[PDB]
Every structure is written in C-alpha cells, then in structure tokens.
Model the fold of this input.
Amino acid sequence: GVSELLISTAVQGILFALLGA
Done:
C-alpha cells in the first residue's frame, strides 16, 4: 500500500495547510 499511502498523505497534506494556517 505504498502508492495508496502516498496519495493519502498528499490529500491530508493539502488539508493540513488549510486548517493549519
């Protein structure tokens, strides 16, 4: 699940920047 883990971290990363401002 390396390919699915990278996509899961990409979506959660953009969401972390919005609510992490």
Observations:
- The longest helix spans residues 2-18.
- The two ends are 30 Å apart (CA to CA).
